Structure formats: C-alpha cells, structure tokens
C-alpha cells in the first residue's frame, strides 16, 4: 500500500546491472500490479549470473532457486568496501550439503549436520556425515570473482485483485478556457475548463 518510483533508483553505485524478465525496465510505474516480495543478500561475484530463473548449479538447488516465470528481477551493486575486512569479514555463508534440490520460494532453515545415510554417524561430523555451510572468505582485496556483490531478488505478484503498489504517476500541467481533451483521474472527456 504505497506508490513505488524507481526513477530515483537510477542513482546508485556505478556497478549497476538491471535486467528484468516479463517486463521492460521502463514500464512499471504506470502499471498497477499487486503486492511485491523482496529479499536481498551479498554474494561472490562470479555466480551473480549463476543465480537466474531456474537453471542448474550448486547454489540454485541448495539455498535459493528462482522460478522461470519470474515477475520481477534482480538489482545488483558492489559493496566490497561495505563488506571486506582487512583480516576478512567472516559473516556470510551458504548451504553446501543439502540432500535435496531446494525449490523456489520455500523456507529452508536448518543447522544440523548433513548425513549421507549408509551408516549412523549420529552427530559425530566425521566421514560421510559432513556439516554444510563452509563460509566465504571476503578478502580485503580480490578480483570481481569473489567480490561481495549486493544483490536483491524482487518478485511482484499479479491477478490485479489485491491492488497494493499500483500506478498513476507522471502528472502534467494545466490549461484553461480552451477546447481540450482530458483524463483527470481515469475519466475521459473533452470541452472547455472554467472556474466553478
């Protein structure tokens, strides 16, 4: 229940890739679509393209999968100075030994070690019973490959019944005492305008 304008969203970090699916990056403000769900996190650079709608990979099936019919898109910028530490900021990490392929948009929270069946490891964390996660490094200096990239994935729904963010923007100036057409708020008409 607010208006959203990404015209001011042009001003951001120079590292800015804005590609979207199902809608061109210009016609959203005029549209009157329903609610939108966002979530964001900072990632090693190389796989910012490995995250996309519904393709294979190590990261796609474990923590986040993106539906193919993806109404919405990703916004990525560079936060290396916001993230990297001299000794390395050890704060980010991802699932590494999930015994399944995680589907798009389901809650996947767990902290117990992975177990490959076979023999009952029973929480020893030895062989064939590994603990996933295995955090990143975030070196103070590194190439764009492991550069922490702040990426937000945003998905807005449709079906037009729960009007949530919606449209009407781009107002126009006024005319008076002249035969003109008009659309004041959704109603169309023509004629002359007078002080009433």
């Amino acid at each position, epitope marked *: 229940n607010c208006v959203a304008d990404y015209s001011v969203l042009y001003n951001l970090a120079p590292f800015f890739t804005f590609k979207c699916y199902g809608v061109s990056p210009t016609k959203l403000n005029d549209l009157c679509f329903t609610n939108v769900y966002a979530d964001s996190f900072v990632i090693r650079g190389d796989e910012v393209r490995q995250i996309a709608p519904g393709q294979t990979g*190590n990261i796609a099936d474990y923590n986040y999968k993106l539906p193919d019919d993806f109404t919405g898109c990703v916004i990525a910028w560079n936060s290396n100075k916001l993230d990297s530490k001299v000794s390395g900021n050890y704060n980010y990490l991802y699932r*590494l*030994f999930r*015994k399944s392929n995680l589907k798009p948009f389901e809650r996947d929270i767990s902290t117990e070690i*992975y177990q*490959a*069946g*076979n*023999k*009952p490891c029973n929480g*020893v964390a*030895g*062989f*064939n019973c*590994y603990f996933p996660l*295995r955090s990143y490094s975030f070196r103070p200096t590194y190439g764009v490959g492991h550069q922490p990239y702040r990426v937000v994935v945003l998905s807005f729904e449709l079906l037009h019944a729960p009007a949530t963010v919606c449209g009407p923007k781009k107002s126009t100036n006024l005319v008076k005492n002249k035969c003109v057409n008009f659309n004041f708020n959704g109603l169309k008409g023509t004629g002359v305008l007078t002080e009433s």
Partner: antibody
Framework: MQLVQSGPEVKKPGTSVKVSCKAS????????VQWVRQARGQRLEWIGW????????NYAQKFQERVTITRDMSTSTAYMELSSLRSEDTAVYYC????????????????WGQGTMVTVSS | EIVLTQSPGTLSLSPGERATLSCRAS???????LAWYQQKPGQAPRLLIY???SRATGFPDRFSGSGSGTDFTLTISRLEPEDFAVYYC?????????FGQGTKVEIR
C-alpha cells in the same frame, strides 16, 4: 571407477613434491580422495583424506607440516605438493576415490590408484 | 593409537583350511569403520570387506565374518588359488586413519 596418478618420478632431494590424483567414474562434487604411503617390502602408512568441496583435512603425526594439497575443482583432480622430505623415501603414494551419485554413497575406498615411483638420490 | 598387531603372521597352509582372519581395534570404533585390504605384491590393495559388516559389490563369495568392537574376525574356507597375498587391517573414524601391519599365508 577411474583414478589416475602420475608416472615414475626422478627428482632432486629437497625442493618440494608434485603429485596428482584425478578421479572419474562418479560424481566428484561430493566424494573423498585418500592419500597413503607404501613402499616395496615396507610398512603401509597413511597420508590424508581431502575433498574439493571445502577444506576438511587431517594428517598423520609426522606429516602435519611440510605439506600442501590443492583442491583443484576442475578436471576432477587433487594435488599434493611441497614435501621437503628426506632422501630415503623411494616409496609408493597410491590414491583412493569412492563412487558417489546423489550424495548417499559408499564409505570404503575401493577404487585404489596404481602407485608412483619417486626416486631421490645422487 | 596403533595396537592392532594381528595374530596371524607368516603361516603355511594346505588347501582346504579353517583360516580365521582377525583384526583388533585401538578404540571402541563403530562397525563399518574397518577395512580388509587385499594387496597382491606389485599392485594396490583392494577393498573387499568393510567393517566386517557386509561385502563389496563384486568379489569372491563364501567368505564373510562379523566382528565385535575390538575383535573383527572372518572365516576363510577352501580359498581359491590366488587369494595368497598380504592382508591389511584398516581403521576409519579416527584422525589419523592409522594402518595395520599385514598378514601372510602360504603353502608348505
């Protein structure tokens, strides 16, 4: 199924070691690679167990130091380097790699290597 | 950390024996963390029986044994001609994975 080492080595005593074990015949995304120590008419000895996924390794008591192993994601291989060993080690290294498919897989190291002939002398 | 010291050393047997292959254990290591490696001289050892619990995929039949926590024993009965080489007792679960000594069998 297939695990390949290097050939015979004639090396000068005391710079480093280069040796490889490249595995195949199974999903190498989550597996184990096992390095041991053997010599002709000699007691068998253990080197280490590593994977490519992430750093999880331990060594024997006398091989804790002067050792490096690079995971080498590509081509399904693993490298051991930087021995700084002694001269009286004309011994076999061997390799081991179990098969895995999907994550739930065998525990033993059945696919063993063939061996390497490392010779440092005058 | 290495106290296996398997009883059989170098003993000669005629075909059709009652061979008992036994490995000890340093600690109360769980089953399936043991391995019996058959090395023919000149080539690497082969994995046949792991932890004295079940056989491997493909190997000779009619020999298998189940062992205790510190006494893993298996029975060899009327062995085929080329099962005459060094046998290795191998341990899992412990860091490091220390290795056994070796067992020799032969014929008069």
């Amino acid at each position: 199924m297939q695990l390949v080492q290097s050939g015979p080595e004639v090396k000068k005593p005391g710079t480093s070691v280069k040796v490889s074990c490249k595995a195949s015949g199974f999903t190498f995304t989550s597996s184990a690679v096992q390095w041991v120590r053997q010599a002709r008419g000699q007691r068998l000895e253990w080197i280490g167990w590593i994977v490519v996924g992430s750093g999880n390794t331990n060594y024997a008591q006398k091989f804790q130091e002067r050792v490096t192993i690079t995971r080498d994601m590509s081509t399904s291989t693993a490298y051991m380097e930087l021995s700084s060993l002694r001269s009286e080690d004309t011994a076999v290294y061997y390799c081991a790699a179990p098969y895995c498919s999907g994550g739930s897989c065998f525990d033993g190291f059945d696919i063993w290597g063939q061996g390497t002939m490392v010779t440092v002398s005058s | 950390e290495i106290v296996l010291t398997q009883s059989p050393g170098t003993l000669s047997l005629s075909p059709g024996e009652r061979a008992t292959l036994s490995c000890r254990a340093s600690q109360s290591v769980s089953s399936s963390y043991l391995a019996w490696y058959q090395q023919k001289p000149g080539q690497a050892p082969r994995l046949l029986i792991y932890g004295a619990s079940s056989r491997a995929t493909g190997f000779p039949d009619r020999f298998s044994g189940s062992g205790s926590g510190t006494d893993f024993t298996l029975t060899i009965s009327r062995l085929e001609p080329e099962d005459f080489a060094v046998y290795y007792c191998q341990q899992y679960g412990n860091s490091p994975w220390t290795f056994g000594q070796g067992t020799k069998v032969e014929i008069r």
